């Protein structure tokens, strides 16, 4: 893993333990690489304990810069 992606779109979902919390512009460190449908990643946080593992579609993220 150790792959990093940028959030082009936001992802916010509550009442779901597998949901990820990310805002557009933030970076996610994914343990997955070349997934199918959706993958699990870790939010790049400064405070330990913040957003551990969440599932999200690779369609809303990319490693390169935006427009």
Curated annotation (Swiss-Prot):
**Domain of life assignment:** Eukaryota
Which part of the chain is the SH3 domain? Answer: 3-66
Compartments, as annotated in UniProt: Cytoplasm
Outline the subunit composition: May not bind CASK.
Protein's recorded name: Caskin-2
Source organism per UniProt: Homo sapiens (Human)
Placed within the complete protein, the shown segment runs: 284 to 348 of 1202
């Amino acid at each position: 893993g150790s792959l990093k992606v940028r959030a082009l779109k936001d992802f916010w979902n509550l009442h779901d333990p597998t949901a990820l919390n990310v805002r557009a512009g933030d970076v996610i460190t994914v343990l997955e690489q070349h997934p199918d449908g959706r993958w699990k990643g870790h939010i790049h946080e400064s405070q330990r304990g913040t957003d551990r593992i969440g599932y999200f579609p690779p369609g809303i993220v990319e490693v390169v810069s935006k427009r």
